[PDB]
C-alpha cells in the first residue's frame, strides 16, 4: 500500500505587532527518528511585502508556496503591477488550498 504522505516535523510561529509582523520557524528537517538537514528554511518572502510558510509535509509545503508565488507574479501581469493586499492574498490562498479539497495539501500554512 503506497502512502503519499509524510511528516517532516518543524514548527513555525507568527505574531502581529502594532505596526509590524513577524513569522519565525526552526530550520531542522526530519524523518522518523533521523535528521535530514540542520538548516532548511521554511519561511519565505513572496513579494509585495508578504511572508509565508507552509509547515507539515515538506513537499506539499514547497508546492503551495511555489504555486502561490507564481500566482503573485500573474496578479501583477493582469492588473498593472498592482500591489497584492495581504487580505486579497489570503482569500486567494483559500482557493489554492480548497482547490485540492479531495486530495488535500497535508500542511498548516501561515502568511
Enumerate binding residues for other proteins (CB under 8 A): 66, 70, 73, 77-80, 82, 85, 87-88, 90-92, 95
DSSP state of 103: S
Given the complex with other proteins, which of 75 and 106 has the nearer CB atom?
Answer: 75
User: Which CB sits closer to other proteins, 29 or 71?
Assistant: 71
Q: Which is nearer to other proteins, 12 or 72 (CB)?
A: 72
How far apart are CB 77 and other proteins at their closest, in Å?
6
Q: Is 57 left (phi over 0), alpha (psi -120 to 50) or beta?
A: beta
CB of 7 to other proteins, least distance (A): 26
Alpha helix segments (H runs only) across 5-111: 58-78, 86-99
Residue 110 burial by CB count (10 A; 0-12/13-18/19+): exposed, middle or buried?
A: middle
Measured from the CB atom, the residue of 77 and 103 that comes closer to other proteins is 77
Residue 3 C-alpha cell reads as: 502512502
Q: How far is the CB of 79 from other proteins (least distance, A)?
A: 5
Amino acid at each position: 500500500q503506497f502512502n503519499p504522505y509524510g511528516d517532516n516535523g518543524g514548527t513555525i510561529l507568527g505574531i502581529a505587532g502594532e505596526d509590524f509582523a513577524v513569522l519565525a520557524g526552526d530550520t531542522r528537517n526530519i524523518t522518523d527518528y533521523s535528521i535530514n538537514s540542520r538548516y532548511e528554511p521554511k519561511v519565505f518572502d513572496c513579494g509585495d511585502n508578504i511572508v509565508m510558510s507552509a509547515n507539515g509535509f515538506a513537499a506539499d509545503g514547497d508546492a503551495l508556496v511555489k504555486r502561490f508565488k507564481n500566482s503573485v507574479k500573474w496578479y501583477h501581469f493582469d492588473h498593472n503591477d498592482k500591489k497584492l493586499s495581504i487580505n486579497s492574498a489570503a482569500r486567494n490562498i483559500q482557493h489554492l488550498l480548497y482547490g485540492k479539497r479531495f486530495f488535500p495539501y497535508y500542511v498548516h500554512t501561515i502568511i
